[PDB]
Amino acid sequence: GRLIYTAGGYFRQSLSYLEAYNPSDGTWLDLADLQVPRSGLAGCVVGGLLYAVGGRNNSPDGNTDSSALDCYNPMTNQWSPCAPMSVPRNRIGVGVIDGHIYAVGGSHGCIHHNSVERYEPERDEWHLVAPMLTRRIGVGVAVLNRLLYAVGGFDGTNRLNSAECYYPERNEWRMITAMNTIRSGAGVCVLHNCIYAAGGYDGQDQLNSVERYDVETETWTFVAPMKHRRSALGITVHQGRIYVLGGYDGHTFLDSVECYDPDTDTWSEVTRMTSGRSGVGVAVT
Amino acid sequence: QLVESGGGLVQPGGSLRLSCAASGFAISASSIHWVRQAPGKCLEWVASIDPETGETLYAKSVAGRFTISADTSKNTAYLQMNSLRAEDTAVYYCARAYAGDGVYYADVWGQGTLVTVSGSDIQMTQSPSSLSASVGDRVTITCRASQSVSSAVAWYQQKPGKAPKLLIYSASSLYSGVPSRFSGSRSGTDFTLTISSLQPEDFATYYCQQSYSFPSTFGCGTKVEI
């Protein structure tokens, strides 16, 4: 039993929730609240510890973009602050290479970043790495065979179908084939040698379509669409299945959790979250 | 087009729901903002919704009393206004908000609806408050931001009883449909709107807005008079 963690998110205001879903029995565990509320963050796990990165606290008394990095120990159920990023990054994308957390893009006010920076937990230090070729907020990130992919998002003016890939040895970004659909606020993950982009927002609608990128062919292909259109969703991969969590669908905040099985090319509903929300950080032990 | 409705005359402590119905486009194809204007007063920004995340922002004066929402199936946005107070009295406008290099400007506005109920913000200082001119004049209007707003300034033209129209965004970019006689520049915190040669249809009130920092704020206008 590994768990699916969902941290923060939004419903009326940014949230402090940390909850864990157990797909074996379909129960949600209610864990130690985040120290500061935030939505538009991203989650990742390094060395057994859950990290919540960036986002923004949209509250009734204000909203403040976050440069925060905080670390959760599931064994102690305690959150600990880490050194912060060089800049606040709301609607950030994160991926892990070689035990290091890569913070990609995101916004600070009107500033849409192309910059990228890397945290080394052994030293509690962030350093800038090569920036992307495009400013991206609401960007989806996933890592496959130590290549990090930044997919879609919004550059301040237009939503994007473009994507690009980070090569760590050379510290260089290179463009990859663009997706078939413009997607900002998609869920992005990796499963069986493909990079998936699910849902998002194209400038006109919230989306239910899903497509994947085969690294071998350099082609994006559509797979089965989700039941519910959704943007600013959480996403993870657990035991060969993609889980999508919450999101906004143009009218309400979703509590639905759908699960994609690649063998059958079908989505099904699984135990929904304890409340509807968007902009969650998600990761899996 | 946006057509508003849902206001009217009410008592303090009441509740109204304003409606903002879209025609010819989807209510989801942008941010939706509400802006209000008290009788003979300065524009005040009220609320916004981001259609990608669902997140709402509210002016401090209305937080926790007003709720902004979108309904995609009815193609109508709403502003639920609870615990109304006298100072809520105003013409309320809905508008689609256009992202220009990370900054939001309102490019399509509703006709406005009347609601009668009976600080650390960036100031944008507009002078003169009124200017008399003849057709053919070169006209210059100034707006000083109380602190740096980078280039996140827009200029709007408003004719009496009608919705503002976006002329310029990002300080100096002309919006489509705006004649080339209008131009805008920045010099630090001072923003100027120039009309090279005033035309009969140019007599109007002109307002500046900043959308650098929360909450967006407007100047109190310059009325260009015959």
Side-chain angles (χ1 to χ4, degrees):
Chain A
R2 291 186 295 163
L3 298 167
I4 291 182
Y5 299 88
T6 182
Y10 177 98
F11 184 71
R12 313 198 175 154
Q13 54 189 47
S14 301
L15 304 177
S16 297
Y17 306 143
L18 174 65
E19 296 177 285
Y21 179 65
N22 190 330
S24 99
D25 68 359
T27 56
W28 280 93
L29 284 204
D30 185 61
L31 310 173
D33 273 15
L34 286 162
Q35 260 272 291
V36 183
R38 49 183 143 165
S39 50
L41 75 166
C44 65
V45 283
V46 181
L49 305 169
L50 169 71
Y51 289 80
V53 198
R56 178 174 74 168
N57 187 6
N58 173 9
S59 67
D61 61 317
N63 64 305
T64 301
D65 299 311
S66 180
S67 56
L69 178 68
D70 296 277
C71 180
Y72 176 74
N73 191 334
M75 226 192 275
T76 64
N77 188 41
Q78 280 199 304
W79 279 107
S80 292
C82 299
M85 299 178 298
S86 70
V87 291
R89 303 181 175 277
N90 184 33
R91 308 210 54 222
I92 184 172
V94 316
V96 170
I97 309 169
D98 290 336
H100 305 158
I101 304 177
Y102 285 76
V104 181
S107 56
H108 173 212
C110 65
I111 301 171
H112 290 50
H113 300 299
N114 67 355
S115 61
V116 183
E117 53 185 302
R118 167 181 54 177
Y119 178 79
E120 318 201 329
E122 272 174 46
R123 324 197 41 171
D124 192 43
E125 276 174 4
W126 287 95
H127 301 289
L128 282 160
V129 303
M132 292 175 291
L133 316 161
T134 303
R135 300 170 179 284
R136 301 179 189 269
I137 74 88
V139 54
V141 175
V143 170
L144 180 59
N145 298 325
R146 301 175 55 262
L147 297 169
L148 190 145
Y149 291 86
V151 176
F154 177 69
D155 64 13
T157 299
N158 310 117
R159 313 198 148 77
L160 308 163
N161 72 343
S162 73
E164 60 187 289
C165 184
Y166 179 70
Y167 298 80
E169 294 96 348
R170 291 221 178 254
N171 181 41
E172 286 179 343
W173 286 89
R174 289 171 221 157
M175 171 270 175
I176 62 158
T177 312
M179 288 177 298
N180 309 299
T181 317
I182 288 175
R183 307 181 184 270
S184 183
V188 168
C189 65
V190 52
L191 177 60
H192 305 307
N193 212 35
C194 283
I195 308 288
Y196 287 65
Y201 170 76
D202 62 354
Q204 298 193 353
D205 293 89
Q206 276 74 36
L207 305 166
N208 64 36
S209 68
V210 187
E211 56 187 303
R212 59 186 196 202
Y213 176 78
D214 179 308
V215 179
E216 174 49 44
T217 57
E218 304 186 323
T219 63
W220 286 95
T221 299
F222 289 105
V223 300
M226 296 173 298
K227 285 198 191 164
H228 315 296
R229 337 183 130 254
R230 57 183 84 218
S231 60
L233 57 148
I235 196 161
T236 186
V237 168
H238 178 267
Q239 291 192 296
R241 286 188 186 167
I242 299 171
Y243 287 79
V244 303
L245 295 83
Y248 178 66
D249 72 355
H251 180 42
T252 64
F253 296 85
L254 297 180
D255 58 4
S256 147
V257 179
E258 300 186 55
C259 182
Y260 179 77
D261 183 336
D263 300 351
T264 60
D265 192 33
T266 44
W267 287 91
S268 61
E269 294 279 356
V270 308
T271 313
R272 40 158 181 56
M273 289 175 295
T274 58
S275 54
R277 61 190 82 146
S278 73
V280 295
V282 173
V284 62
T285 310
Chain B
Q1 202 195 175
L2 294 167
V3 299
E4 305 173 43
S5 77
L9 173 75
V10 304
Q11 306 216 287
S15 286
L16 292 173
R17 180 165 141 276
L18 306 182
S19 46
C20 172
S23 280
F25 66 96
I27 202 68
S28 54
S30 60
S31 290
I32 294 287
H33 292 200
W34 286 89
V35 179
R36 79 190 172 179
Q37 183 173 34
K41 284 287 166 192
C42 299
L43 289 162
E44 176 185 22
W45 171 92
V46 169
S48 71
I49 186 164
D50 177 344
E52 187 166 317
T53 62
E55 296 205 12
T56 52
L57 294 167
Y58 300 96
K60 287 187 192 284
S61 52
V62 306
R65 293 183 299 119
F66 292 8
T67 314
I68 190 183
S69 66
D71 178 18
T72 267
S73 57
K74 294 183 161 171
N75 212 29
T76 291
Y78 298 99
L79 186 70
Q80 183 70 46
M81 302 185 307
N82 299 322
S83 321
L84 282 159
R85 31 173 92 148
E87 49 256 73
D88 293 326
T89 288
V91 178
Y92 280 72
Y93 295 99
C94 181
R96 307 177 76 180
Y98 168 68
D101 207 352
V103 185
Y104 285 79
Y105 309 97
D107 65 326
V108 173
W109 290 66
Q111 84 287 355
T113 194
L114 186 52
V115 175
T116 309
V117 187
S118 205
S120 83
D121 297 347
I122 302 177
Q123 297 208 19
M124 300 296 278
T125 301
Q126 259 184 273
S127 74
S129 70
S130 65
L131 185 152
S132 173
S134 316
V135 172
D137 288 349
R138 157 171 266 271
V139 157
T140 282
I141 304 182
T142 296
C143 169
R144 294 187 86 169
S146 63
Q147 72 198 73
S148 182
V149 295
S150 188
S151 286
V153 174
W155 282 94
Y156 292 93
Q157 178 190 64
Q158 197 180 36
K159 301 179 143 172
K162 296 290 177 157
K165 169 184 185 182
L166 178 61
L167 302 176
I168 303 297
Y169 62 103
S170 303
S172 60
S173 295
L174 209 51
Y175 201 70
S176 61
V178 185
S180 71
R181 63 180 179 279
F182 292 89
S183 63
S185 56
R186 175 201 172 175
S187 167
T189 53
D190 295 327
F191 295 80
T192 59
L193 171 70
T194 302
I195 318 180
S196 56
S197 178
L198 205 59
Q199 298 309 116
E201 65 269 32
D202 298 336
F203 294 85
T205 295
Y206 291 86
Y207 293 101
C208 56
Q209 179 203 32
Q210 70 80 23
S211 308
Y212 181 70
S213 207
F214 185 81
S216 308
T217 48
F218 295 80
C220 292
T222 293
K223 180 188 184 212
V224 180
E225 305 167 320
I226 314 153

